[PDB]
Amino acid sequence: KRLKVVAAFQQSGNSPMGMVLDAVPVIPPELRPMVQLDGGRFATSDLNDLYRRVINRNNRLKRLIDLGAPEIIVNNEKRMLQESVDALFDNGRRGRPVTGPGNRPLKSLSDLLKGKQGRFRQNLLGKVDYSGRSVIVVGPQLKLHQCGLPKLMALELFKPFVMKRLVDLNHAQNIKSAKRMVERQRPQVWDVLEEVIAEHPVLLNRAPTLHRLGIQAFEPMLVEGKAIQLHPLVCEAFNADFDGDQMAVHLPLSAEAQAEARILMLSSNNILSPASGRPLAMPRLDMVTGL
Amino acid sequence: DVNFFDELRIGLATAEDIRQWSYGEVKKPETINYRTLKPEKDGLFCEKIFGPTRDWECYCGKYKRVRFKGIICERCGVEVTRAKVRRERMGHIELA
Amino acid sequence: EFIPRPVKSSFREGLTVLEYFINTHGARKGLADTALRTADSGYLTRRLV
Amino acid sequence: VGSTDQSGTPEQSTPDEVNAALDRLLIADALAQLSAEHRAVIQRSYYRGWSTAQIATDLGIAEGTVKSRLHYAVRALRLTLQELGVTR
Amino acid sequence: SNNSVPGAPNRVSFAKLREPLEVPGLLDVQTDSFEWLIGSPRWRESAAERGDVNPVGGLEEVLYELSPIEDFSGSMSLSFSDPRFDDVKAPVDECKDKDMTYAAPLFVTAEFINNNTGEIKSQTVFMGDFPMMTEKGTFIINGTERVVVSQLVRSPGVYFDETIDKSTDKTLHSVKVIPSRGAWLEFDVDKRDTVGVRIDRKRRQPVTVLLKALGWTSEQIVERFGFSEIMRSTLEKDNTVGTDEALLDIYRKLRPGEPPTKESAQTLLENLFFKEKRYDLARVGRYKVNKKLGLHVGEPITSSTLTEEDVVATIEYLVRLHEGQTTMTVPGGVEVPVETDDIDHFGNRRLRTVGELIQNQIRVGMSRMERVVRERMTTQDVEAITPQTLINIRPVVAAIKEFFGTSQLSQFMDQNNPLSGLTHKRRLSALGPGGLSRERAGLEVRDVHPSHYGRMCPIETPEGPNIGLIGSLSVYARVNPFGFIETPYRKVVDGVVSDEIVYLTADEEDRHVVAQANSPIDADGRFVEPRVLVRRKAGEVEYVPSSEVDYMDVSPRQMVSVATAMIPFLEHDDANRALMGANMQRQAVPLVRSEAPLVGTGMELRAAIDAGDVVVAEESGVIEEVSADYITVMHDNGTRRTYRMRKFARSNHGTCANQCPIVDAGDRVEAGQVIADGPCTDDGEMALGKNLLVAIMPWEGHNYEDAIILSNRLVEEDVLTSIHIEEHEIDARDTKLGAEEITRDIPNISDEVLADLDERGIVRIGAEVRDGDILVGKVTPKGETELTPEERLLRAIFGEKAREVRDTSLKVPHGESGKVIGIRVFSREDEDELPAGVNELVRVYVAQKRKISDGDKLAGRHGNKGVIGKILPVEDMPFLADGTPVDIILNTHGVPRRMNIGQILETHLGWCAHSGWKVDAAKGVPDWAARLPDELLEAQPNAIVSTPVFDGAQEAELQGLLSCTLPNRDGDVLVDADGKAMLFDGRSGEPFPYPVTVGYMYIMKLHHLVDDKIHARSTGPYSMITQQPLGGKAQFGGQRFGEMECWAMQAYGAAYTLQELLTIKSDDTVGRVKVYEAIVKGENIPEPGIPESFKVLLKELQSLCLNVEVLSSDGAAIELREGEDE
Amino acid sequence: WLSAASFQETTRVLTDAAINCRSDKLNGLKENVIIGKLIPAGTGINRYR
RNA sequence: CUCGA
DNA sequence: CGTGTCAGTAGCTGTCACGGATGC
DNA sequence: GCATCCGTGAGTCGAGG
Ligand SMILES: [Zn+2]
């Protein structure tokens, strides 16, 4: 295992001297911002405190070096500068973490990347516009490829598409006033909205997304009310009862995304379970009793 | 800025690399002024180092218009571009 | 382990005070461990992913 | 008082550029219906922010020529916008 | 009859067991705790008859423990005495309106005692504005009602544990000495048969190092611990010997870095464990030690400190337990068993309430001031010193402010319905300071413990991540001054039930055996069977002779909570759905009009009155004048009291708290009677829902798996209509370029949008406002140097000069709509104290009238929940023989799985209540109605009945009532003796082939409405740092396509949909704008760019001294619109 | 190393990544998701794209 | 903090 | 600015399985 | 050469504070 570390510095051509720092970089301010509070006071990022304590102790060391202070003060100051940079990069790694006000450990630069709240899992592996969510309600009359979304959800979801059509049919003079019409819900938009969502598939999602059938594509149907109407046969895939569940809606924009929803993700093209091959969209509760 | 580039290389940052990135040293420990909201010079938010708070607005207030695009102000040392640079310009602290 | 005394009554008949009390022991821990068992399930799932 | 990492502090947000993008699209349409002279003068006064004498020096024209071209080109754009229903 | 004490409606109970003890004050936990803290006359008289001699309140106890304050010499002294309160600063409702704190000024008497001059100056010193508790058991911090929650903490004392080692597989033992305050001390026996001790988390020293430091010779140690070989191996393996040697060994491990003096360690080893300054076992902590060790068990509790004798007896208790011993007597002490403790047992698990939690924060605030006192003494002169100069009340008032302002125990009050508030004040929370962390709570702290019987409810607890950590206090339970929970029992003398009732603690209950409440008892008191179901220690249930029963339960419902005791036929519902049934009753929404349930339990009356959301008459009298605004009562003596009605007030959760008078003019009303009832109340009883005609049948798939079908009559007749009120707020501040002003003049806005505003820019009272409408017109000045090039050109091509202000008006959020009912304006110009930098403040109250909609969540009392899937017209509904259509259709499939038959039994009894019954009196009383009271043999239609928990109606009597249901107005009986009835299909006309169960069920409207839960977003705000869309509906954010959702796209192979979601639709700064343009232009969707979040990741790896670079196919590094200089 | 640093033990992976000076060929499902490229699977492979 | 699936 | 008699955290352990570098 | 101890991991989404 020692060779594993030594051979890495030998072949690569980078010096191990990089493990000892002569200068520490400062992350740009917008990534550690200081915001003003509605009470007149200020709230800042913890990284500013860590950088500030490194600056305070490094400037004090420069004074001791200039003053020729006893080696006991200079050495005991250099130790503190070591612990400050250790807290800036990974507070809490060695010993007890630098606590802020209220015995709260300050976040370090490495804390921006760790765990579920880190940069990778929170802002890279998962992130979206053109989406919504509401309560789901059973719709027996719907076909397997159909779903019912509220009119008020579809208007906001298809807002730019509706603005485009409001200005084509000369319901609105310019695209600017076409936006004010959708925001004010002028009665012309409900006739225009029906033309827009025509054969434009949408995606329905219920968390937790355990398997790939946790997200399926449907043909939207403008329905009154404020609840999403879901087909009774896709309830098994979503593991979705109707005791207060909510589902998310995502609108594919590009031609490729709509084609992926129309062909790959359509609920009618996914009747069988990919895990076992046995059907899922089949009579399950009232339907099996009726038959 | 196309989206096809093959490799993503990572390595140890030389102390000389830290200086090659840095647009200036953060000397003072102060942050901003609590009346004018203007950041103090050489502080953790110094506009001479990181960039202007507002677009095309310098610290001392001599250059506030777009016509002076790219001028390094002589009295406060702040460049005049958009505040987008305050998301990418690195600083550094030179250790004793 | 199972209690040496069973719940003889049925929910149609109506449990006694002590029968109901001893029933809640298994009912609550049945819901309690379900939150932990789903955490280890989802953790194993993302390792397999 | 406060730490952004600490809970209870609202995160900073920036509005969307929809209103700005729509105005930019309508200004780009009204700009195309202008003469190459007027278009090359409003794009040097409002898009580049130069002075009146700076545009006069670049285009090799008189001082009042830039003042007059700007004076009409603004009204020409107001004609095209009011014809398309742009709100005053 | 049920509850014939205040003058309530006559609800007839199916009671076979008499109630020996009536329900206590449900608010006593919050009330009695605070009365002791401030030493109210009610607490003092309560402690007077309790037998106490010279009792001391919580504030007096802190002043006596603090007094006196002396320096090192003793030349200066300060003392405090006589705490008293002046009248409250402002009334309760004024604090809610002006966003201040309900408090009363606290006065004390302080004096300076000077030994070197022989003269004392005494005076009155104001300590601080002390937050006061309202009559409803709540505090008001900055205009918001809060509830201080009682905390379950580990009781102080000495505790022993039997742990099993990991590597050697031998049984180990450990001891913990947990004080009420100070340093901790834990002894243990490791796997090497040696004894050690960890002192305040520090390093583990050999147990003899502590003995040698206290002054014990090495010979006396062998004399005391000689019977065990594991202690002989401890003194032998010991490193250092000597009284002045191990004392310095402790010093260098406890306070490192300091010169070790024989007297600097002699000082702290006495102060940290034996001086009352830095160590203290409470009166309960001392008593718990004197019982666990069996010493001083007869001496009056005077020692408030740990002693050296206790440390020795503790080590003696440990060493015997390790080698199998089961009994021990301390030298000079009573005999006591040797065992390990539960720490979950309610005799070792203590509950500290409001007064103690506040007292501890006062004690810490006093100690911070005491240090200021000692410092101000040695600085100022010793002749101009007064109590006013030594006292700095800043850390004291800031200590109580820190508590009420920020504490897991100071909680924003639940105010959905009166029951939710009552339950909140009776909560028992294990979380918080001194308790435990949520990450530090295994499956053992959360489950039901046999000592919770009659103390903490085993049903009412959340089902989320706080399951088991939050419980509700049982009905008859109470808290003793020690902190444990007592529950009443009927003392059985010699197999005879007596009306003498005594409260027993957890361990006191284990020292006896108690009989179940529903025991067959003779009219004299003797048990019918020799063997009866009896509960014994360690959770044992078995039969036992009648001459063995020591006590028995007061009431059947003794073990359940108030909300749980409100579930009829609870004994027929499994614990899972019963938990949801009680938890969802607290989620009921107050309706416009309230109906008391036909099938009740009797608890609804006392639950409503003790909640405090009704209006009860304090003194008997007649009604002089009654209005919708107030009620005036003319007393017998001649005085008048007038009660003001709370009308259309916004609760903490947006519900409508609205009180209505019940009595009329000139009505004689007794004391303690309900003269006006508020939300979720009908004639003084909790009315959490409505009585709906239910049919149990599948109906065309609209009620499929837990969906609900409703009659449109409930919409037409406002049966499930509720009022909701939202609060909107905006302020006008001082900015860098001027000041924001609230004005009707808004740039580039027509006179039509501003038509609903008054001359100030505020919306007028009564105006109906949709989403997007202006509520408060505010403009903020924007600088010229902040203008877009297009915006400056757009300003030039419109000639509108002097518009240096932009629009920042308060608009109505998406999904909001209602009538403006109230406006409140606060102006710095008009003496109103606003925060510094604010010139004006406006609050607008909007009320919406919400009818029941498709998707709103309804539920019953038995955990039967579901959303509304379809609201058919009244003619489509399956209707009975006489044409009356049903109101609600419930799917049958979701009934026998959940094991909640109570809803079926409620439906049967509910119908019998609606129709009435008449038992055949001729030829005697039938054999099924022999146990029923005579008041139940006849019932008029729409009668109210009570089915108490674990008592009440039996299925034999219920089956018999269905057989003699009263006929309708035509004389026809609609439902059969089975309980089913013949229904007609309203859509076709053909009658349904088979009879269907039909009756009346109590349905509640839960606070989960689609009007709030619907949300959608095209574009909107983005987080400044990550450039991703915001979160939450209130911020107009987008949905999160999480990690698991990306796996689904990849599983489908939907590469383009996945890339589109993570780029242009999220955090592509230039891609999202060009997509919006491409849509309004009709062009195609452009190509996705690089996510801004990935740019931030690289810039953060750089700040960690990592050189990250993106290389092209050739190998050259490519930058991202940026460079690097030195 | 980019697919590993986003899974578990972020600092333990980034340390060894900078010492060994590893270069990541951005050709994987997890990597393309982070940088915004089309995943090399389904409709993203060069055969169908 | 508390709650919903 | 000058500083000068005692002058000394809160809080807390009520998580655990598991693997391998660290250490007597 | 091995017992100790350090560091790692521990469901997803949503509402209001
Ligand atoms: Zn300047």
From Swiss-Prot, chain D:
Q: Which signals induce this protein?
A: Expressed during growth in culture; expression increases from lag to exponential phase. Has a weak SigL-independent promoter, is also weakly autoregulated, no other sigma factor allows its transcription. Forms an operon with rslA.
Explain what the UniProt record notes about the effect of disrupting the gene for this protein: In a single sigL or double sigL-rslA disruption mutant, no visible phenotype; not more susceptible than the parental strain to several oxidative and nitrosative stresses. Infected BALB/c or DBA/2 mice showed a significantly prolonged survival time relative to mice infected with wild-type bacteria, although bacteria proliferate normally.
Cysteines paired by S-S bonds:
none
**Which sections of the sequence are annotated for DNA binding?**
52-71
Q: Where is this region: Sigma-70 factor domain-4?
A: 30-78
Q: What job does this protein perform?
A: Sigma factors are initiation factors that promote the attachment of RNA polymerase to specific initiation sites and are then released. Extracytoplasmic function (ECF) sigma factors are held in an inactive form by an anti-sigma factor until released by regulated intramembrane proteolysis. Over-expression of SigL induces 19-28 genes including polyketide synthases, secreted and membrane proteins. Might play a minor role in regulating SigB.
Summary of subunit composition and partner proteins? Interacts transiently with the RNA polymerase catalytic core formed by RpoA, RpoB, RpoC and RpoZ (2 alpha, 1 beta, 1 beta' and 1 omega subunit) to form the RNA polymerase holoenzyme that can initiate transcription. Interacts (via sigma-70 factor domain-4) with anti-sigma-L factor RslA.
Q: What is known of its domains?
A: The sigma-70 factor domain-2 mediates sequence-specific interaction with the -10 element in promoter DNA, and plays an important role in melting the double-stranded DNA and the formation of the transcription bubble. The sigma-70 factor domain-2 mediates interaction with the RNA polymerase subunits RpoB and RpoC.
**Which protein is depicted?**
ECF RNA polymerase sigma factor SigL
**Name of the gene encoding the protein in the UniProt record:** sigL
UniProtKB/Swiss-Prot annotation, chain E:
Effect after changing residue 410 to T: In strain: vr3; rifampicin-resistant
- In the UniProt record, the gene name given for this protein reads rpoB
Entries under InterPro entries matching the protein: DNA-dir_RNA_pol_bsu_ext_1_sf, DNA-dir_RNA_pol_bsu_external_1, DNA-dir_RNA_pol_su2, DNA-dir_RNAP_su2_dom, DNA-dir_RNAP_su2_hyb_sf, RNA_pol_bsu_bac, RNA_pol_bsu_CS, RNA_pol_bsu_protrusion
Q: What is this protein called?
A: DNA-directed RNA polymerase subunit beta
The protein's matches in Pfam families, at most eight in alphabetical order, are given as: RNA_pol_Rpb2_1 (PF04563), RNA_pol_Rpb2_2 (PF04561), RNA_pol_Rpb2_3 (PF04565), RNA_pol_Rpb2_45 (PF10385), RNA_pol_Rpb2_6 (PF00562), RNA_pol_Rpb2_7 (PF04560)
- NCBIfam families cross-referenced by the UniProt entry: PRK00405.1, rpoB
Give me the reactions it catalyses. Answer: RNA(n) + a ribonucleoside 5'-triphosphate = RNA(n+1) + diphosphate
Consequence of changing residue 429 to W: In strain: vr10; rifampicin-resistant
Keywords from UniProt, A to Z, are: Antibiotic resistance, DNA-directed RNA polymerase, Nucleotidyltransferase, Transcription, Transferase
Q: What is the effect of changing residue 412 to V?
A: In strain: RJ37; rifampicin-resistant
Signal peptide span per the entry? none
Q: What does changing residue 111 to R do?
A: Weakens interaction with TRCF and CarD
Top EC class for this record: transferase
Gene Ontology cellular-component terms listed: cytosol; DNA-directed RNA polymerase complex; peptidoglycan-based cell wall; plasma membrane
Protein role: DNA-dependent RNA polymerase catalyzes the transcription of DNA into RNA using the four ribonucleoside triphosphates as substrates.
Impact reported for residue 409 to P: In strain: vr2; rifampicin-resistant
Q: How does it assemble?
A: The RNAP catalytic core consists of 2 alpha, 1 beta, 1 beta' and 1 omega subunit. When a sigma factor is associated with the core the holoenzyme is formed, which can initiate transcription. Interacts with CarD, TRCF (Mfd) and RbpA.
The record gives the effect of mutating residue 424 to D as: In strain: vr5; rifampicin-resistant
Q: Is Ribonucleoprotein included in the keywords of this UniProt record?
A: no
Q: Which family does it belong to?
A: Belongs to the RNA polymerase beta chain family.
| GO terms of molecular function | DNA binding; DNA-directed RNA polymerase activity; ribonucleoside binding
Q: What is its EC number?
A: 2.7.7.6
Gene Ontology process terms (BP): DNA-templated transcription; response to antibiotic
Curated annotation (Swiss-Prot), chain F:
| Signal peptide range | none
Spans through the membrane: none
Report the induction information: 6-fold repressed by starvation.
Q: Tell me the domain of life.
A: Bacteria
What protein family does this chain belong to?
A: Belongs to the RNA polymerase beta' chain family.
- Give the record's subunit note: The RNAP catalytic core consists of 2 alpha, 1 beta, 1 beta' and 1 omega subunit. When a sigma factor is associated with the core the holoenzyme is formed, which can initiate transcription.
Q: What does this protein do?
A: DNA-dependent RNA polymerase catalyzes the transcription of DNA into RNA using the four ribonucleoside triphosphates as substrates.
Supply the name of the protein: DNA-directed RNA polymerase subunit beta'
* Taxonomic path: Bacteria, Bacillati, Actinomycetota, Actinomycetes, Mycobacteriales
